[PDB]
């Protein structure tokens, strides 16, 4: 018995069908936590998506569970240790999400830098009347781009920015080997230096206890006036309220984000919404967690999660297991 | 001192560079100068510094017999009758490189923004109705896509430079082939025009407006595109037939149109439309910018400088470094 909480490609149902009894959700809807939990009561397997939160109380109510196959990279809403305590494999997708998310993050950098939203609303209002000196903005040429985090998305973005004439630097918990540093023209800097010397700041790190509200009032206070911040990872890696305050005083030049604190279900004090004053600020650009919203990629993400689930159900160690 | 007419506001530093050599008739106030007013200022001028709003035809030159050089603060001189300039011994100069990169940057941004439904995505978040991830808002990435470039000069190349590592298959069609070193370097393959339009997931324009390129992207070429193909125009409005573009959008064949430029601003075109069609402005599968390709302020100051230096070379009797025409 396998529960799939959200819609997947028919080809994926067909790969699963001969090994598993499928309890599926082929709608564009997200079901309530209580319905998902009802479906998983006697389930051996769960295919889990971004809206899902799995904790000890969840696992306790589902004693037959052998594997959670997550169709995602950041498992921050899944209690890994609780999974391991109850003999449950926790599985993720380590690479397939990286490229479309990195593409979006560059696009958001450029869009934020060039006042794309405002520019577009201006043409659409039928007020455009040929060239004027207006909407002057920030490009990547001769700029300094700093990466917080240098794993999959950091590296993919660094690859993609090779021809953009920018100076690249990064801060991470784990250093790149210096060979890769030379080849990508990356300089490793301290976090303070990162925030003080970067015209663009691209966040590329997971959400965990140590990264929660890491990007706070203190780090923001170090930024060059007009610096641009882009968040393609997890909302709670920044203090959205400190981001707002930084924008209102004019020090932060722009915040663009694909992700929001309000999505981070594992948090007891999770905000119920994005602050209306952040939505209203002109120096912003937002997308609704579409980092990997390419259909062709979704198929492969679904397939990878499916493969992991079938491996676990066959007694094997899943290739992308997150626990041991 | 030779008299120099500047049609638009310029940075103070540029006044200081020019005032020692020329009498300046400036427009630092940016007040709307009518053709008739510009002619009045230029009637006994030895030089004009021209910008994107300027249009110079044979009748204009005729009325300005002292002119020796028109210094253009721009790349695309489609609005300046070069041949008429040459025949009257007036240098015409432009700015070959300073506009390239920021325009290339904008256009990749527009490609990604168009591909990923940025406008609608942002509206949804800003609406207050975001509830977290959903299996919707699906888009088109660059990885595994075929990107076709029409034109392969300064901007075409800056764009190709910027797409290295993006996992895309790169192809192009131009009036002149790229050298093989550069095709090898950038992974670019040369193909016919029609082939480019039939096999590209992204089509990125990178060509000037002239009599051969006018309305080149017409109903005929658009009828070849893969359904869902995305078209990006950072060049001139009129290399495209916006009406044929709109119909291709409404039909559902063309997946999207993004533009930094519009037919309505191509002033030398007697028959240009008076506006961008409201139905195109209202179409969901679009993304627009108001001719801000070069709008990075570090860059505008240098654009003005370049045009100013060229004027000065011309006035000193030199052949100006960035002359477009060639004089006997
Ligand atoms: N918006 C989306 O659609 C989307 C898609 C995929 C991933 N993500 C999120 O992005 C995060 C990162 O993605 P990835 O694939 O690059 O992950 P990754 O694990 O490959 O890279 C993480 C990087 O962050 C660094 N890091 C960890 N703790 C840090 C700290 N305290 N300070 C500074 N750096 C630290 C690591 O050293 C590593 O360099 C994921 O955890 C996920 O939550 C979002
Ligand atoms: N949006 C902006 O702010 C902005 C900024 C700079 C330039 N531009 C416009 O972009 C245009 C292109 O700029 P560039 O710097 O790349 O010019 P360029 O002269 O360096 O390159 C033009 C390219 O177009 C090709 N071409 C010419 N006629 C063609 C045809 N009939 N079919 C196919 N290809 C043809 C040429 O072979 C050349 O490769 C300029 O003429 C200008 O109008 C716009």
Author numbering:
A (entry chain B): 4 to 327
B (entry chain A): 2 to 329
The authors write:
Phosphite dehydrogenase (PTDH), first discovered in Pseudomonas stutzeri WM88, catalyzes the oxidation of phosphite to phosphate, which is coupled to the reduction of NAD+ to NADH. The enzyme follows an ordered kinetic mechanism with NAD+ binding before phosphite. The crystal structure of 17X-PTDH indicates that Arg301 is situated at the dimer interface, but its side chain orients inwards towards the enzyme active site. As such, Arg301 is in position to directly affect catalysis, through either electrostatic interactions if it is in the guanidinium form, or by acting as a catalytic base to deprotonate a water molecule if the guanidine is deprotonated.
The 2.35 Å resolution crystal structure of the R301A mutant with NAD+ bound shows that removal of the guanidine group renders the active site solvent exposed, suggesting the possibility of chemical rescue of activity. Crystals were obtained that contained NAD+ and that diffracted to 2.35 Å and 2.65 Å for the R301A and R301K mutants, respectively. Comparison of the 17X-PTDH and R301A X-ray structures, both with NAD+ bound, shows that the mutant has a solvent exposed phosphite binding site that is covered by the side chain of Arg301 in the wild type structure. The multifaceted but incompletely understood role of Arg301 combined with the solvent-exposed active site in the R301A mutant prompted attempts of chemical rescue experiments to better define the function or Arg301. The poor activity of the R301A mutant could indeed be markedly improved by addition of exogenous guanidine, methylguanidine, acetamidine, aminoguanidine, ethylguanidine, or N-guanylurea. We show that the catalytic activity of this mutant is restored to near wild-type levels by the addition of exogenous guanidinium analogues; Brønsted analysis of the rates of chemical rescue suggests that protonation of the rescue reagent is complete in the transition state of the rate-limiting step. In addition, sulfite inhibition studies showed a large increase in the dissociation constant for binding with the R301A mutant, and sulfite binding could not be substantially improved by addition of rescue agent. Collectively, these findings along with the X-ray structures illustrate that proper positioning of the side chain of Arg301 is very important for efficient capturing of phosphite, which cannot be recapitulated by the rescue agents for the R301A variant.
